[PDB]
Amino acid sequence: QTQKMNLFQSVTSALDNSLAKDPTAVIFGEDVAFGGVFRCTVGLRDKYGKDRVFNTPLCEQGIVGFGIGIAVTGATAIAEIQFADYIFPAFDQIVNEAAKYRYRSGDLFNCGSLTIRSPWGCVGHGALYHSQSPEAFFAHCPGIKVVIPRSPFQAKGLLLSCIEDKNPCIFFEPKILYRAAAEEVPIEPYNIPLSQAEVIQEGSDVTLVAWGTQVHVIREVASMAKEKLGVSCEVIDLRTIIPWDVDTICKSVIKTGRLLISHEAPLTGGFASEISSTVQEECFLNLEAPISRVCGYDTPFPHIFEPFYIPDKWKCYDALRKMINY
Amino acid sequence: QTQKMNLFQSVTSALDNSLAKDPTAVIFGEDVAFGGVFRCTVGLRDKYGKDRVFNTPLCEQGIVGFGIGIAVTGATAIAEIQFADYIFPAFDQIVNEAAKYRYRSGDLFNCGSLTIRSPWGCVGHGALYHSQSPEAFFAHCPGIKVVIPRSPFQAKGLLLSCIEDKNPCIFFEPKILYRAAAEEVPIEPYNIPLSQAEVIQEGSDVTLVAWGTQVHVIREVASMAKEKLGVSCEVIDLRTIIPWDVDTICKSVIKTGRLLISHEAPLTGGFASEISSTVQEECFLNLEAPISRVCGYDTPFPHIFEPFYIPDKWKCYDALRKMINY
Amino acid sequence: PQFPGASAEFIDKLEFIQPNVISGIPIYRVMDRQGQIINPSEDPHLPKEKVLKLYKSMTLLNTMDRILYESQRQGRISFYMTNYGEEGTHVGSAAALDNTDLVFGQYREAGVLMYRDYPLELFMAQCYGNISDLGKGRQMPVHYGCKERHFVTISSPLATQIPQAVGAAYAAKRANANRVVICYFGEGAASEGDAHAGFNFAATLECPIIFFCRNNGYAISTPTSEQYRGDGIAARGPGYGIMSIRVDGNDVFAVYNATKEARRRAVAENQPFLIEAMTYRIGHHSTSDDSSAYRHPISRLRHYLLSQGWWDEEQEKAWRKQSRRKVMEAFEQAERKPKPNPNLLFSDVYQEMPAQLRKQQESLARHLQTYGEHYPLDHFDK
Amino acid sequence: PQFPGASAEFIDKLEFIQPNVISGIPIYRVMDRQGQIINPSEDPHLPKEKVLKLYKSMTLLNTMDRILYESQRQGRISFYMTNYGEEGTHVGSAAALDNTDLVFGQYREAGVLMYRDYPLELFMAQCYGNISDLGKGRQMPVHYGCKERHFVTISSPLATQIPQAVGAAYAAKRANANRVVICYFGEGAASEGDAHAGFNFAATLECPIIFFCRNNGYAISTPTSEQYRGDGIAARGPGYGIMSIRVDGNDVFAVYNATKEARRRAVAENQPFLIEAMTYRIGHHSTSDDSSAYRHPISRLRHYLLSQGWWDEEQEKAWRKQSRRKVMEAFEQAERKPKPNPNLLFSDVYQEMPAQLRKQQESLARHLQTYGEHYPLDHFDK
Ligand SMILES: Cc1ncc(C[n+]2csc(CCOP(=O)(O)OP(=O)(O)O)c2C)c(N)n1
Ligand SMILES: Cc1ncc(C[n+]2csc(CCOP(=O)(O)OP(=O)(O)O)c2C)c(N)n1
Ligand SMILES: [K+]
Ligand SMILES: [K+]
Ligand SMILES: [K+]
Ligand SMILES: [K+]
Ligand SMILES: [Mg+2]
Ligand SMILES: [Mg+2]
The missing domain is CATH 3.40.50.920 (Rossmann fold)
Structure with a gap:
């Protein structure tokens, strides 16, 4: 069964499949409860509950530390950074903590069930802080995986793969494609190998x-x-x-x-x-x-x-x- | 006139020449008042005053934002990050603010009189958080300059050049060389071109x-x-x-x-x-x-x-x- | 006791301290919803002239906000943020300021500039990214700045200016400038790590700074009930050792008084001051937001203007016309100007252009010589 | 009023709120400097057995701290941090905890583990980076961790665990675990942006968490007078809506009581609790610090042990000997073990080793086949 989807819709789809499959999964970030600034988590809080989809205070360093905290519990943490340009307040939490959680504990603890989504790339006129492509910054950091999709279909497969990968993954969503051309995207879960061109x-x-x-x-x-x-x-x-x-x-x-x-x-x-x-x-x-x-x-x-x-x-x-x- | 110096001594030297020449210059960071954890600002607070060399609270994001604040005033701000491994809490302040101060204001304001020093590279057993070489992370960022010295002589010239450059500069000091072999280093100010191999x-x-x-x-x-x-x-x-x-x-x-x-x-x-x-x-x-x-x-x-x-x-x-x- | 970290008598009893959130810090107000001065002992000096400037600029801003928002709804400008309901907030504080004082903001205090007589031409120039914009069309609209009116160029990353402002204040102190620094931010931004940094440093280093928080109940979709659980922002100031106060953000006099006092003591004692102005964000968070999907200053000061016979309906009617004409006049002028020369996207990255950066410059040149027909060269300067 | 961000009556008067720092929050204490219970209504349950465990582990930690510090002064181990003067802090809180509760620390709470019966062998194994270290000698000494005693592996970046702990607490809440989470940090670390984040999130999301602050007057060279100007850390809790309390860090009973109460209410109301334990850092900040360049728990509980006839000098004399023998016995055993196999520096970066990462692995292999004589291959495993 398949429905035609927008990049932002395939994301809601993958996110829906996830809360649906994983009783543990939780989605949080700034303005995520009412559906999000790009409509990626629309309806989700109603379909799954206030304690599975909710707003956090406006603090990205806390958002990620918080996510790492849940992950350590073995629970799936899906954190959202409204704009990739605003992920730097959390750079320390990502590089010094997350990317090094498993390694520094000799596999005693990890935040491998942590995933961070964030609108990426330019749009009409994001100017300096709604257009950045932080990808390279995180590339010099062992421990995290960085995935960027090119269409609604690739988005849902890759995202779901990210959400289930046993390693902290940053998922950058080209915001310019959120409402671009649609395409048939499987209604149910499905994955696409990470680390495969x-x-x-x-x-x-x-x-x-x-x-x-x-x-x-x-x-x-x-x-x-x-x-x-x-x-x-x-x-x-x-x-x-x-x-x-x-x-x-x-x-x-x-x-x-x-x-x-x-x-x-x-x-x-x-x-x-x-x-x-x-x-x-x-x-x-x-x-x-x-x-x-x-x-x-x-x-x-x-x-x-x-x-x-x-x-x-x-x-x-x-x-x-x-x-x-x- | 020249004296034989340790890397850490040449740094105190350059820093002394600076407060001596620039009535505006100010040095601050964690534990900098009593001389620093590596002895780089020893004596300086006594020779120049409590309001020219002082301790800040333990918060690197504030340390740099604070430095950017002074710089904007046209005053020389010399911020210290105890370890290069702990500069990430301030990564946002450096990439989104400092590296973009002049550009985003069409040259109306800048933090070009801002300099950040920080112990760099490995040592005996720094392990994961006293050994990092963050250099590459900042390399993907237009607006800041990144300088790393290889000896007491190069240190003082480059540092002083950094302190006086009209662009936010990050000066990484290989901590392993702080007490290595000494060498004659001019007692008075002197510069070494930045961006010159x-x-x-x-x-x-x-x-x-x-x-x-x-x-x-x-x-x-x-x-x-x-x-x-x-x-x-x-x-x-x-x-x-x-x-x-x-x-x-x-x-x-x-x-x-x-x-x-x-x-x-x-x-x-x-x-x-x-x-x-x-x-x-x-x-x-x-x-x-x-x-x-x-x-x-x-x-x-x-x-x-x-x-x-x-x-x-x-x-x-x-x-x-x-x-x-x- | 003797403990180095705090001074306090011991206590035989185990008692946790509970946040007093029911009857939190009182909201200071000078005049009622009908421009009437409650407690005369609080009525400010304020000559007819000054009080009228407060009015005309709150309304001039309101007139401008409408023309620009509509302008956005027509693709004329790419983005816009209104100030509806927070005009008293901008004008009161600004008036209590010395023109040479440094201002650091978020993006919702255009009134501060209006009061400091910022040219309508320049407000429009920045939003349009045309040649007259001293910013050289490099940032989104509303990201104003003026080295002359001492308004630090605004940036998008929330709360970053807070610690910067404190640093700036420290510089000031050392210069014996008799100058203070004001740093505006929304209640949402206060959750940012930099806010924590800003407040502590300010107190710990004893800086001449005023922290002005606009608690307007929202942070886009997020209600304050989700940004904090304490008695708002005002209640955090003390924890940092900062003299704190809460004010009716729709009362220009209460804002003015608080600000005037904060400036006196801040410059006198080199002591940080926090002002939380309670208010409500009447308009959408931005052009890009449909506020109905998740959820007055001018009126009041108007009454006060009548009760003193300082304004009438005829006079008002004419002001609408003049301000309208004037705004729209800057509007058209900004519209028909070409955007800066494309070479300007490479300048100011550093003070001097790096050779390698210059190579990229010349590259775009060779490139445009050959494909420029696919670019909007006619829309830009030169 | 009606303002969405806070609830409070108005006020005709302009009054800034001044920090009450003179008679700050009282320091809670149960027994005096002579093991005497001040207010009987506060004397805990605590059977002779439990009270003796508190003593033997504070002293076992002290005995261990000495042997390891000296060990550092001999190049035997590269780094070390003592707990001198903060033993009550570790043992009191830990005892008030349920063994299954999650612990997140800074690096100065080894007592928490001692109480949770962590093997002397493993304490030594980590500091030596030998094979028995479950950490595989990857971090500096003192960076302990145990998934079994539920002690989240410690990391060097200060304050980072705070927000993490809160997240962990949220997970807990959802599971209806009846479990609480404790997060330790020094008064210095509290200045970090993550602390601000941690406290707010905890309150805003209603989490079962205890924030345990060790205000020991110092942060290496920096005196508290330079870390803040408010009434210490205890006074910030309320601003965030967090039930707060201050305790005599050298009083194991006052720490125990506070902790026990915080756990009850935290797990019951899903409400964050903050405990600031006033104390003093007797030893150097670390092996790498000469504290004399810039600037008791056991004793007290001992008296209380005498006043009840629960301990005597002969019994004590023997404990010194046993603990000494036992510590030194783990010491030698850790000393003579080889460090892990060099191949372990490439594992656990990710769960699975990336192919490219494996290529670097095999590379070191080829490399050692040819130059291994220049490496300390004999010191490592395999
Ligand atoms: C560091 C950072 N994270 C996220 C954003 C996106 N963002 C822009 S405005 C906003 C909320 C506005 O908050 P508040 O401080 O209440 O100000 P207001 O606009 O309501 O006056 C957010 C989350 C940002 N600009 N910077
Ligand atoms: C983010 C970060 N910045 C700097 C350091 C270096 N540093 C290590 S310990 C310390 C001070 C100790 O502070 P406090 O919280 O009072 O703990 P204590 O050691 O006194 O118990 C500092 C600044 C660090 N570990 N992490
Ligand atoms: K993951
Ligand atoms: K500079
Ligand atoms: K800003
Ligand atoms: K940590
Ligand atoms: Mg707001
Ligand atoms: Mg301390």
Whole structure:
């Protein structure tokens, strides 16, 4: 049985399946009770109760510490950070505690049943604090997993996988896709492997890597690429950031010989760095052209300059041109 | 006029020169009044006053917000975070505020006269929370500068440069060097350019890049290298992490054709990634061997396993062997 | 006793201290819902002129709020937040301030600026992100700032300005500036870790600061009953050693008096002061919020203006017209100006532009030379 | 009034509320400095047996603290923190606890474990990082933990456990566990943002939790006079709506009574309770600190033991010997054991080892095959 869904609806779906299956599961954060600022937990408090879906005070460091507390109990804690831009007050709780819970206790205690959801990426005009892509910050941190979906279907599978994974997981939801194109999404629970990149279009001349909304962009740059330069691109969706599918990538690049990675996040320190430097080491012989990185600028996210800030399809394409014209 | 100094003494020196020159300068943090936990601000409160060197409550997020507050006033704020491992409670204040102060106000206000010092890197047995190298986390953040010194002389010049730079700067002090070998250090103020790598030993076969205590290590791996494999290594000290000396690096690599970067910090997401991926793009033709990264493991910092965790000289050397034997 | 951490006699009896939340801290009020002064001993100085400025700016803000909110409902501006019901809060406090005093805010105190005579042109310029915006259209609308009217540029992360403000106050103290610092924040923001930091540091370092809390009963969807269980914010001040008071946020005189006193003592004793202004958020949390999915200052001061024969219906009728005309006049002017030159998104990241950052600059240049037809180059400057 | 954020009558008068710091919250005490019960109506039940366990474990901890501190001064162990002067604090509270109750600590409550009969072998094992340490020598000494005695593994970042504890308490509530949760922290840690978070959440979500603060006058070099200006920590509880009490930390009975009451009401009303135990940190902040550069429980309970004829000098003399022998016996045994196998530094990062993480594992292997002579392979297991 399947229903057509919005990204935000598939999330409510996965979240519903979870409270439904797990008597322990609990959802909390700022303004989550009435449905949330993006409608992700709508109805849920009525269908399951005031002690399973509720508002916390306005304090992100407490929200996560609180979540870690429940998790330690073996109970499923699904914390919400209204905006990924506001997850830093909790950065200490995530890096020094959660990512290190199991390890420092020699497996005596853990917060593996802890999951943090948070609206990610840019939107119309989030400016500096409703547009960030914090992903790279958490990538330098052993112990947590970081997952970013690209559509309603991927969202529900990945999220549910995150919720049930035995490791603290951060689930970043591209807010720009919350009301974008719908799609049939299974009504009941279902999972999608974490740490598995997905090739959604094989090609033979270049390997394109991105995640989140960017995937749809590299997907377009593909259409253009071949149709305007006769070049078959292999489009790949990374999905999981920290424990990343190193193999699926290197394999593709070996078949291709060229690599172009892109992400809204700033260039410097961005995740594309770890990928490039890695593929460079692995596929050093297969590389016919220098690895390319089409990322946001090394500046904060502009309000009125967004159109000029992002690695839109044109910036990628042109970048692809120069690479190929190598 | 010059006196032989410890890393911690050169720091007191630079800090003394600063309060002495700048009537505005103020030093604060946890336990800084009586001299500090590492003796970096010893005597200073007596020589300059209780309102120029003082203790704050035990709250790092407040310490930095407080520092940003003074800075906005145009006054020099020198905040101390006892351990780099405890800078995360203030991560939001640093990334969302400080790194974005000037930009978001169109240069109407700034905290450019703000400097944060903090003991960095491992020591005997810091375990997980007295050994971290947070550098990479801040690298993905436009607006702040990140500086790490390798000796008493470099410390005082860089620090003073940081204190006077018109941009929020994080100064990480390798605590393991606080009482290591001394060295003549000018008694009076003096600066060292920020964002300038230093080649302290030119070579012709390989370029070695590191920072902090690691520099002394790649320096040893050099002695070994030539003396055991007849290979001239060009040792480079990065010094500044965020606005990094891209040129000094790429130049060297162009002359060398091979690159090996190392740092205590974990491999994944570590700063060596940004360097590799960049040099790969720039010196793509000069590269005779895949760029090498000898970093800490993708795990938290072990108490009893430290000896096996770090990228000691042997791990680097062997890594150098395989590279060269390319 | 002798214990270093506190001074107090012992006690043979085991008694837990219970929060007094029933008859919590009294709400201070000067005039009733009909502009009538209750206790004359509290009636402020306030000459007709000053009292009329308080009125005209609360109403000028209200007139502006409407024109901008509608403007948002038309896609003219991307975001907007109203001040409905919290105008007394802005104007009272501001008037009790010395113009050179530093202000740190959240985002719902545009009245503070209105009182400090901030140009309608600039209010509109920021929300539109056009060239006249000194911010260079880099932040969302309502994130105002002015180095001249001493209003620290507002940022979105809640409560972050609190500790910053205290630091600023410390700097002040050292300069013997005779200047105080005011830091506004909602009751919701007070839950943030930075609030705890801000209050403690302020007391511990003895700073000339006023903490102004706008307890308007809400934090978007969250009711205060979910933000705390103590006697609101006013009751936390003492725990930190901060002189605290609660005020009727819809009474401009009660706000003014409290603020005036807090400033006197703060600058005199280098002692932090906390003012919790009870009020109610009449409008939606923001343009992006349908407040009906989960849940007056001007009127009052008006009466007080009549009871003294300081205002009449004809005079009022004309003010609506003038303010309307004036606001709408800045409105149109801001509308037809082009947004800044795209090169401005790379500047001010640091004081000096990093070479590598400049390389990205030049890159967008080469890029626009070739694809600029796919961009809104005509809408921006140069 | 009608304001949604608080309930209170208005007030014609402008009066700031001043912190009552002179005669702050009374310090509760049951017995005097000579083991004499002041007010009989407060004398607890406590059978000779239980009262002797409180004594033997405070003293067993003291005997252990000495042997380990010296051990540090000899390079035998890398770090150590004593409990001198805060033993009553650990044992009183612990005894008032139900063994199944969850404990979250800072690092200065080893007595809590001693009371819960934690093996001397394991105390030594952790500090030495040898094989018997269930922690696998991954953290510094004193960072104890036991899933069996329900003692959440301690971590270095101060105050982080506070919010975690509250979350844990919430989980509890939902399970109808009849279980409570205790969260210890120093007066210094209370300045942390997480403390603010912890207290508010606890009250706002109605959790079965006891906040136990050890106000020992210091935070390393920092005197309380620099950590706060209010009436200590006890005075903040009410602001959050938390039943609060202060106790003589050197009075095991006053600690016991307070704790016992807090547990009853916390589990009964799902209401947070705060206990501030006034005390004094007799020893150095840690092995790494010379406390003389900046600046009794056992005795008392001893007297009470004499006044009841429950202990004598001969009996005491023998206890010194036994505990000494026993501690030293675990000591030697921990000393001569090898540290875990080096492969253990890669495990438990995640539940399952990531393939890439495993590649680094195998890498150290190849590496040691070739250079292991430069490593302390003989000191580690396997
Ligand atoms: C650190 C942080 N977390 C979350 C948000 C999102 N957010 C914006 S406004 C708001 C609530 C408003 O609270 P209150 O302080 O009562 O102010 P008001 O708008 O009601 O005057 C929240 C949670 C934010 N801006 N910053
Ligand atoms: C977040 C954080 N910042 C700094 C430190 C370093 N530090 C360790 S112990 C300590 C002070 C001890 O304070 P208190 O809470 O009074 O506990 P005590 O040791 O005196 O019982 C500090 C600042 C830390 N562990 N964590
Ligand atoms: K999980
Ligand atoms: K600076
Ligand atoms: K702010
Ligand atoms: K902790
Ligand atoms: Mg509010
Ligand atoms: Mg203490």
